[PDB]
């Protein structure tokens, strides 16, 4: 109950068998696999009370499981389809409903890996009119043209991650809403005092962690292979 899961993030093509593994140290009899989707909460897939004891939950179709050991409970997508894109959580329980959750597996299933694409990222500097009107200065980061929707955005000021003064959109938007494989975009704001923005020594960086292809994946296009990577944009403070 250090409950641990592997992998943490994964993208897969449709029609592939994919395995997620849950391991525990406390050797509780009871282990569970859930999926989380927006608006549906956590739905139980399968659960197990001992080795070779397996029970269906509400959404077991398309999945199988194995309880290979007291410590291990494996979940497979038998032949991945796009609606199996979800956050997957394993859990253990004691005999008194004391649950311990793993930290999650974010899994995205795409039809075509050819559509995977890292973001382009830009920082937009504060308006002079904002600075004069409010004595505050808002930077905007825009991340565009990425697929799938599997990113983490952060801000870095003089090389240290910052949380204060930041707001990032809770979900990316579709660039082309009519398309099932539309690329995505995401914005974030960082607000500082005008004095701080006006110091030419301060450095501001928006970082986007993108999850994509692995080194293992075939790539046949001339454009850059869209591997998991960081894409940043930056600005320095401006006295004028």
């Amino acid at each position: 109950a250090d409950v641990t899961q592997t992998p943490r993030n994964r993208i897969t093509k449709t029609g592939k068998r994919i395995m997620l593994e849950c391991s525990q140290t406390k050797g509780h009899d009871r282990m569970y696999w859930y999926r989380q989707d927006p608006g549906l909460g956590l739905r139980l897939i399968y659960y197990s009370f001992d080795v070779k004891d397996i029970n269906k939950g509400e959404i077991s179709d398309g999945y199988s499981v194995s309880r290979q050991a007291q410590a291990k409970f494996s979940l497979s997508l038998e032949s991945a389809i796009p609606n199996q894109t979800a956050l997957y959580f394993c859990a253990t329980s004691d005999e008194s409903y004391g649950y311990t959750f793993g930290s999650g597996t974010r899994l995205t299933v795409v039809e075509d890996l050819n559509k995977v694409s890292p973001p382009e990222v830009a920082v937009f500097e504060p308006s002079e009119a904002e600075i004069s009107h409010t004595q505050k200065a808002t930077l905007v980061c825009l991340a565009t043209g990425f697929y799938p929707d599997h990113v983490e955005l952060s801000w870095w000021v003089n090389g240290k991650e910052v949380h204060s003064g930041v707001c990032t959109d809770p979900q990316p938007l579709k660039e082309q809403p009519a398309l099932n494989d539309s690329r995505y975009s995401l914005s974030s704001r960082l607000r500082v005092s005008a004095t701080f923005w006006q110091n030419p020594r301060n450095h501001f960086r928006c970082q986007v962690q993108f999850y994509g292809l692995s080194e293992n994946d075939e790539w046949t296009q001339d454009r850059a292979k869209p591997v998991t990577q960081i894409v940043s944009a930056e600005a320095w403070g401006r006295a004028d």
Partner: protein
């Protein structure tokens, strides 16, 4: 036969007001009941649980819930809504003597008390070379909401609240952008109902 029902996928509360998140269950025999919170980006954390015992249960940070059999309820409350309370909250129940089943979740949106609003639309420029720009609608109070754009080449985000800890200062903003040559920040938010005193600099 057993289930758990949360009312409203998304709910609002004014900063400083009583927090109330509702949960009801459908079990004949009283179940064990649980409230979990999921702060953004993170896993589930248990807040409190009813495990027969006391009817009024207490969690961290002022959270409480009272088990009420006669109305099959286990509503979560906290005395005062803080901006840090923004999260998704899940009610959950024991079922079939073998598992916990989860409600669908409610996201709590806390409306900041903006006592001196200063609504404005500003234009910002790309730090790298560019006739490339975005429009920032900012500093409006929580009576303003932002509408999705009418134009398929104009992109507009949801409003988002930031908290500048350095100055104890909270503000709302939404961002709009377009590649179009005819895109002006004066027009970016025309599909939204904006405050009559919104500032539009030169």
């Amino acid at each position: 036969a057993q289930s758990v029902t949360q009312l409203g996928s998304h709910v609002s509360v004014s900063e400083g007001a009583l927090v109330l998140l509702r949960c009801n269950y459908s079990s004949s025999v009283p179940p064990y009941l649980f409230w979990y919170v999921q702060y953004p980006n993170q896993g589930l954390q248990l807040l409190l649980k009813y495990t027969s015992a006391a009817t009024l249960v207490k969690g961290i940070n002022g959270f409480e819930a009272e088990f009420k059999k006669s109305e099959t309820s286990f509503h979560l409350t906290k005395p005062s809504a803080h901006m840090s309370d923004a999260a998704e909250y899940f009610c959950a129940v024991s079922e079939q003597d073998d598992k916990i089943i989860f409600g669908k979740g409610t996201r709590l949106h806390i409306l900041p008390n903006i006592q001196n609003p200063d609504p404005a639309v500003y234009q910002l420029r790309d730090s790298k070379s560019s006739d490339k720009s975005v429009c920032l609608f900012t500093d409006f109070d929580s009576q303003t909401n932002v509408s999705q754009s009418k134009d398929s080449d104009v992109y507009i985000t949801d409003k988002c609240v930031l908290d500048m800890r350095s100055m104890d200062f909270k503000s709302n903003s939404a961002v709009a952008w377009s590649n179009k040559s005819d895109f002006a920040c004066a027009n970016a938010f025309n599909n939204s109902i904006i405050p009559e005193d919104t500032f539009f600099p030169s």
